[PDB]
A paper describes a structure:
Zinc-finger antiviral protein ([name]), also known as poly(ADP-ribose) polymerase 13 ([name]), is an antiviral factor that selectively targets viral RNA for degradation. [name] selectively binds CpG dinucleotides through its N-terminal RNA-binding domain, which consists of four zinc fingers. [name] also contains a central region that consists of a fifth zinc finger and two WWE domains. Through structural and biochemical studies, we found that the fifth zinc finger and tandem WWEs of [name] combine into a single integrated domain that binds to poly(ADP-ribose) (PAR), a cellular polynucleotide.
Structural and biochemical analyses revealed that [name]-CD binds to PAR through the second WWE module. Specifically, we find that the [name] pocket is configured to accommodate an adenosine diphosphate unit, which is an internal repeating unit of PAR. However, the [name] pocket does not fully recapitulate all the structural features of the prototype isoADPr pocket in RNF146, suggesting that there may be differences in binding mode. Further studies are needed to determine if the [name] pocket has preference for terminal or internal ADP units of PAR. Mutation of the PAR binding site in [name] abrogates the interaction in vitro and diminishes [name] activity against a CpG-rich HIV-1 reporter virus and murine leukemia virus.
Author numbering: 509 to 623, 630 to 696
Write the structure that this text describes.
């Protein structure tokens, strides 16, 4: 499994070293692939802070230049392990990952769904979890759209205009993860 263990972050994982899940001190783990071994980056929090900004697809960390779109760096491929999505666990599970869904508007900027769309980030995330190849119809004002997960785009069904859609976590710094563990 590539899923960061929630129990290890909170009160503790009873499975100890035999847990099938990943045990890490953060709810995210950023890694590069060198040979046949995934290797931890050094400045995970800086990378995560860049990832969680939807208007940022480039992140220079160390000598590395990271491209989030492609999930590679220099030439090497990267990945972000994660706790489960927050819609998959009760609200008590404070270490779940909260995924925000955004669309890019006329004026070039990223607007959160719900901020007006009749779908919000929890809606879309829930559908995306229960069906990642889905197409979500929705309405905004008097206009009607379809959001294609597998394409990560929204299309106005009348004019067929397309707009990008992006899914990124909310950021938590390590100091706040430590506060949550108190
Ligand atoms: N998911 C959304 N949620 C809220 N508002 C949205 C969303 N997506 C687009 N909009 C906004 O609603 C308006 C509609 O834009 P689009 O539906 O993306 O595309 P389009 O219908 O081609 O643009 C409208 C224009 O096209 C012409 O047919 C007509 O003259 C109209 O002025 C724009 O202001 C756009 O920024
Ligand atoms: Zn565990």
């Amino acid at each position: 499994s590539e899923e960061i263990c929630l129990d290890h972050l909170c009160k503790g994982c009873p499975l100890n070293g035999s847990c099938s899940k990943v045990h890490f001190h953060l709810p995210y783990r950023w890694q590069m692939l060198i040979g046949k071994t995934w290797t931890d980056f050094e400045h995970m929090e800086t990378i995560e802070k860049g990832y969680c900004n939807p208007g940022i697809h480039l992140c220079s960390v160390g000598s590395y230049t990271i491209n989030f779109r492609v999930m590679s760096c220099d030439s090497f491929p990267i990945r972000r392990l994660s706790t489960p999505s927050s819609v998959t666990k009760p609200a008590n599970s404070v270490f779940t990952t909260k995924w925000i869904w955004y669309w890019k508007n006329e004026s070039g900027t990223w607007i959160q769904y719900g901020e007006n769309s009749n779908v919000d980030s929890s809606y879309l995330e829930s559908l995306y979890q229960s069906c990642p190849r889905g197409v979500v119809p929705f309405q905004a004002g008097s206009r009607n759209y379809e959001l294609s997960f597998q394409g990560m785009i929204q299309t106005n069904i009348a004019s067929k205009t397309q707009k990008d859609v992006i899914r990124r976590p909310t950021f938590v710094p390590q100091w706040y993860v430590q506060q949550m563990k108190r």
